[PDB]
Amino acid sequence: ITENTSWNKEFSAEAVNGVFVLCKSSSKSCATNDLARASKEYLPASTFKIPNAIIGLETGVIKNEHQVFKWDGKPRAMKQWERDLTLRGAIQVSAVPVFQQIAREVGEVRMQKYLKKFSYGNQNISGGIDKFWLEGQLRISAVNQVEFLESLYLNKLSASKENQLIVKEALVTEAAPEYLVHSKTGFSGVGTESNPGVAWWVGWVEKETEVYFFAFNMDIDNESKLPLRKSIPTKIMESEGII
Amino acid sequence: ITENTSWNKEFSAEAVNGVFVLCKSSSKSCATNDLARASKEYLPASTFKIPNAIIGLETGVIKNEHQVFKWDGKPRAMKQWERDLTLRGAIQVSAVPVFQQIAREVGEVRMQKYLKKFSYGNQNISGGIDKFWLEGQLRISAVNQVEFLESLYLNKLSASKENQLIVKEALVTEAAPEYLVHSKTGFSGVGTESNPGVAWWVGWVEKETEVYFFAFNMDIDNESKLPLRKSIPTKIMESEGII
């Protein structure tokens, strides 16, 4: 892990307290703007759909890649959630209630076992089984996300290769012939001014025959600032030539 | 399969002879502009990279999804054939020597067997092992393309589910949160008015919780008419409400 001071240019303009971890090839070659914060642990929020999706497939709670999560016609917190969704759809609109139901059906004993297998953050799923990742005690760092996401890309999580591949295609956010982006956003809320929420963007990019892993988080107490979880990192990668 | 002749004005407008087959949910619900052309059988050209990549993974000739195809210092009268490529890159670009070499390494016995198992068109690999799909005897129909892709889609080809998932990820060419396209062009070359080449566009669209299988082909005797392989089909799909 090395510190790259100049990447604080991108955070200073908006007064962003955040961090970016960028890894070329593997998690042994990482650069960050902030070495302290790189291993500070935060609520993972909807970045947790990655492991939960894997675990749901692993456990058979999610039947297969083409399973349809039917809307029941009842009020959900976002309009975008009020429809049938595939596993990809539900991940890409971050349909929380789908994944809270998945977690209930997974159950606490199995959730705990997989997070241990994944070395997922502090592995503390206390705070209730359908919310420990949004409002409970579960905490993970940007570097731990890189390492987790690097195991997924390599298919090295303790889960089947088919289930890891299924999740990988659900994460695709940008396609071209010699560039592919896998990523996932997260956002825990705006907290208070003294105790802010966290916003995330994690993923990796395949450019030509190279692969870059990344994990961004930032303190957020204003929802208007949200799109900075993608714009900051995108700028940094663009300035590294990651197209 | 039904005929929808009002799609022909999209062919006539550019003065091409062509067919388009479009199926909603499965290959039991298919429509085409020309029933006779839809079953007619054409050199697959570079649509053959789908079967060939799968067979390459199944045979071990392609080691895994993270294999890089290295440039040797090929002469190559294309620039394209002098870069290193991932499997997605090689699928998505002109990479003639990669697929020729995969075919020779699979070989005729293994090739024949999997094309039999895939029910690929006329199943005729005469003409030379590293060119049967392009200048030899292999012919396939728009209808048969759609059936084969459907099988791929359902992981129902006689190949591991894992190798089918790796070929699917590498055919992704559009992605939005509830819209995902897997597609593959093909082109045999510009011919003459009375001995035309063939051009293809084949794939599937995932839109919300629906899938559409499609396949197009056209006689080509003008290099300018090539992009008609996506625009005609895109035009039909717009007019059917998919896009």
CA distance B206 to B209: 7
B185 carries a ligand binding annotation? yes
CA distance B165 to B153: 9
Secondary structure (DSSP) of chain A: -EE-GGGGHHHHTTT--EEEEEEESSTTSEEES-HHHHT-EE--GGGGHHHHHHHHHHHTSS--TT--B---S---SSGGGSS-B-HHHHHHTT-HHHHHHHHHHH-HHHHHHHHHHHT-TT----S-TTTHHHHSS--EEHHHHHHHHHHHHHT-SSS-HHHHHHHHHHTEEEEETTEEEEEEEEE-----SSS-EEEEEEEEEEETTEEEEEEEEEEES-GGGTTHHHHHHHHHHHHTT--
User: Inter-chain contact B93–A177, Cβ cutoff 8 Å?
Assistant: yes
The domains found in chain B, sorted by start residue, are: 1-243 (3.40.710.10)
B214 carries a ligand binding annotation? no
Q: How far is A211 from chain B (nearest CA, A)?
A: 10
Chain A, window 113-172: residues with a beta carbon less than 8 angstroms from a chain B beta carbon: 154, 161-162, 165-166, 168-169, 172
- Phi and psi at residue A66, to the nearest 5°: -95, 10
Q: How far is the CA of A54 from the CAs of A95, A102, B143, in angstroms?
A: 16, 11, 35
Which one-letter DSSP state was computed for residue B239? H
Would you give the end-to-end CA distance of chain B in angstroms?
A: 22
- A141 annotated active-site: no
Q: Name the active-site residue from A25, A27, A39, A46.
A: A46
* Nearest by Cα to B23 from B186, B145, B166, B185: B145
Torsion on CA atoms A72, A76, A79, A83, rounded to nearest 10: -20
Question: Which residues of chain A make contact with B154, given a CB cutoff of 8 A?
Answer: 66
Chain A to chain B Cβ contacts (< 8 Å): 70
Environment class of residue B193 by beta-carbon count within 10 Å: exposed (0-12), middle (13-18) or buried (19+)?
A: exposed
Secondary structure (DSSP) of B172-217: EEEEETTEEEEEEEEE-----SSS-EEEEEEEEEEETTEEEEEEEE
For chain A, give the residues followed by a break (C–N over 2.5 Å). none
Residue A91: closest CA among chain B residues belongs to which residue? B177
Sort residue B189 into left (φ over 0), alpha (ψ -120 to 50) or beta: left
Chain A, window 175-234: residues with a beta carbon less than 8 angstroms from a chain B beta carbon: 175, 177-178, 180, 206, 208-209
Q: How many residues does chain B have?
A: 243
Pick from B154, B162, B178: which is nearest to A162 by CB? B162
CA distance A85 to A92: 10
Question: Which residues of chain B make contact with A65, given a CB cutoff of 8 A?
Answer: 155
Q: Is A43 in contact with A188 (CB distance < 8 Å)? A: yes
Residue B93: closest CA among chain A residues belongs to which residue? A177
Pick from B83, B166, B209: which is nearest to A68 by CB? B209
Residue B163: closest CA among chain A residues belongs to which residue? A162
Pick from A174, A206, A209: which is nearest to B175 by CB? A174
Q: Name the active-site residue from B26, B39, B46, B141.
A: B46
Tell me if chain A has a CB within 8 Å of the CB of B63: no
Residue A169: closest CA among chain B residues belongs to which residue? B169
State the resolution, in angstroms. 2.4
Q: How far is the CA of A237 from the CAs of A15, A74, A203, in angstroms?
A: 20, 41, 12
